[PDB]
Design a protein around this nucleic acid. Structure first.
Lengths: 78, 96, 93, 108, 93, 96, 80
DNA sequence: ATCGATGTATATATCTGACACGTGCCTGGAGACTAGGGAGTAATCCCCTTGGCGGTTAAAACGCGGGGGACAGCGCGTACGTGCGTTTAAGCGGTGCTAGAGCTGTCTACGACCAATTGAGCGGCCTCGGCACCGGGATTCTG
DNA sequence: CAGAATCCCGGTGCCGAGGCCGCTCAATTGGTCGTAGACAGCTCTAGCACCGCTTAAACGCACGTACGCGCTGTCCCCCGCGTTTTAACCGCCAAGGGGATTACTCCCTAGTCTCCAGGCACGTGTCAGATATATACATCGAT
């Protein structure tokens, strides 16, 4: 159970970058669930591309393609 | 004594973190979380050092965008405090 | 000129699922559009998957992977079994 | 065998017309590719690159810097109404957000 | 082995717009991926237009129509103007 | 005389139009509007009888979807009547 | 021209009724008309662009289908 | 009626190590010649496109009697913020191992391209039965 | 709980789906052989693990003031119903611009073969940058 590794201070800092002035005490568990759901959909795709190539090492390109298919093209990692 | 009024430090934090560009989540706890989720699909997986960073950047950009939207739908209700229903409403209108 | 369509095949399947039921021209037009839509999505993804590996030929493995990527879990679970059975029977013939 | 000279020089372009032509033929977009397609596409790409670099370079001087970094590109894109429309969905690493606070949040 | 990127051409253009400024490797990586993105969009749209008209070749007419579709109203006017200038100079060279 | 209370007829209409399927905008006014807007780009254009129907169907679907989204935003503020700020919010969140 | 007035108030009411709206404020109509005009303009510009590429003078249903297809919404029943 | 303490900003001092010019070299790009079929062009047929007039109520308009939904206001209680204190494991520097990704070489199974045939499918016409419009009734559900 | 709005059934009645023959041109069987996809054998990089000291950050606790919320007043404006107005609406009639085609015919391209110079690595050095110091003064607060 490593979901507890996303500590409360990090959540506050992220809300601060977004301009949030005051945060209710229940936002943390919802944010944890949202992050877990977002990660699962990307990881499943990355693993799918990795397996098709018969490689055992996950590569940056696999994540780049996985994000592009959902429309979240990421610039910077080649 | 001397003490700042509630919320002024928050505004100073907003002006600070909107100016900086570093990553805000701890690298090692996030790496362990990525390691834990991938294990359900395949065993003995390896991750390049840059892959976890790419995932972290994407997750932080997603949370930032979701919080930006949640703030708008929070002010709209004449509140300032964001709450779970604001996230659920934003996600519903966004179609997710 | 002569215009091709999938209408006769859709009708044969309908007659197998419900022999007593019929279909209007509007439904035939919708099905005729839906088939081309899904065809283009799968062929497109199979093409992208081919270039990333420098392969010059598309094979059933590319189709299986594209199907698993495009369709949701249970639909993919059944469709992969259908395709596997079909390919097995075809190769055995 | 006359002395060869590059097509990019004849058109007056910096981008490589030969490489763009090769990439079109190897992409299977069509079985035949006309002579004018690559010269036009190269000219368009050169224009868009020059506009981005010009705006980033102007943004750099405002910070007394002499070297371009990702933060200046992000500030250049999110500040232009045309570039922002073409790049509304692209995410840039290390870019951060633009400074903005809703007037309702500022002190009374 | 030998890799391929546009960093050289971006540098040549940079020295023409601002001859006194330099660019970091982090900005260069973003500029290199941006070009590959726009290249893929234009070639994709041009191929679709060519297929609908049932034509075997891609010409400047296809590029122009795609450019008018993908790029906003103001960028298109300038881009098309210099594209036609380039083609005119090449054909007249 | 017999008179229905406010809203009873609205619900009856909602049920009627949700169960029905015909188009709701008049064909001729829309046809004239389509020919009018096209006049700014090119003169003497011609239109097929089905193209006007396709445009009408697309417009009715788009507007119905926007009104469905706007209703959630209206209930969120504890109101029932939809208002322009709700439309503006829906469009902003959708990224229009 | 005045043709924008051709989308009368009752048509807007029936459309809002289909979406389940029970009560509608009197100012929604002008916003709806403005919202509709920009969509039509956007779709027609692409349609006319496709028509012009083909050198045709009549605009066909296929051009509208492709315009909607590019904007990210697909229409079933008219062709394609 | 007003004064100042914390923090951000800024300025001067210092060394680190990324950006830029160089040489060597290798294989992508441009020069020269050829064959063919995609494309450009004119003529034709004819349909489905634009334009008009008849006339009847569907649909829209303008009034209006009025009640229910909207906001602006007061009272308040406990949820969240700022700050101090303790300690945790996040951070970093270094040595080692080897899993496993990427390149060289041989090789033969699979596919695209040709000759020839013919029935699955496309087209126009016939026809007969499921939906459609009507009318009369009991019922549901509401103010 | 009287009674207006609704569903439902029996009847008359009509053109859409379902069936058919003509016949062609898309698909199939059989044939060939060029290069791509398959493997093993091997190089050497970097992902994984542990050692250790230090501490940036975290967990935790106190308390106080600021926000979210419930009830309230009351009014002004969308609703539900009535009478008058109009252009949509079906339908019948003209007639011709444009769309779809055959046929000709030519020039723009893909292919083979040559060869060199553009740009892709390994080598580096110096000066653009960040870190470490003190201090000015603005704001938010207290007096």
């Amino acid at each position: 159970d490593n979901i507890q590794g996303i500590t409360k201070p990090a959540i506050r800092r992220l809300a601060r970058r977004g301009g949030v002035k005051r945060i209710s005490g229940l936002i943390y568990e919802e944010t944890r669930g949202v992050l877990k759901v977002f990660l699962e959909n990307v990881i499943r795709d990355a693993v799918t591309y990795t397996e098709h190539a018969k490689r055992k090492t996950v590569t940056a390109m696999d994540v780049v393609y996985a994000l592009k298919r959902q429309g979240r093209t990421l610039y910077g990692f080649g | 004594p001397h003490r700042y009024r509630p919320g002024t430090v928050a505004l100073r934090e907003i002006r600070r973190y909107q100016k900086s560009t570093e990553l805000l989540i701890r690298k090692l706890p996030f790496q362990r979380l990525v390691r834990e989720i991938a294990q359900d699909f395949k065993t003995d997986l390896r991750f390049q050092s840059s892959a976890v960073m790419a995932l972290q950047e994407a997750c932080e950009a997603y949370l930032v965008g979701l919080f930006e939207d949640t703030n708008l739908c929070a002010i709209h209700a004449k509140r300032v405090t964001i709450m779970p229903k604001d996230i659920q409403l934003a996600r519903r209108i966004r179609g997710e | 000129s002569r215009k091709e369509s999938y209408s006769i095949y859709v009708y044969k399947v309908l007659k197998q699922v419900h022999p007593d039921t019929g279909i209007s021209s509007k439904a035939m037009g919708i099905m005729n559009s839906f088939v081309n839509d899904i065809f283009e999505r799968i062929a497109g993804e199979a093409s992208r998957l081919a270039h990333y590996n420098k392969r010059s030929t598309i094979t059933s493995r590319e189709i299986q992977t594209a199907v698993r990527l495009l369709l949701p879990g249970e639909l993919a679970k059944h469709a992969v079994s259908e395709g596997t059975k079909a390919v097995t029977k075809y190769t055995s013939a | 065998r006359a002395k060869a000279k590059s097509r990019s020089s004849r058109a007056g372009l910096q981008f490589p017309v030969g490489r763009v032509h090769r990439l079109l033929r190897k992409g299977h977009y069509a079985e035949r590719v006309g002579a004018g397609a690559p010269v036009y596409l190269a000219a368009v790409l050169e224009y868009l690159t020059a506009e981005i670099l010009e705006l980033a370079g102007n943004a750099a001087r405002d910070n007394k810097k002499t070297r371009i970094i990702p933060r200046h590109l992000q500030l250049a894109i999110r500040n232009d109404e045309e570039l922002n429309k073409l790049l509304g969905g692209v995410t840039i690493a290390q870019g951060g957000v633009l400074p903005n606070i809703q007037a309702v949040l500022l002190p009374k």
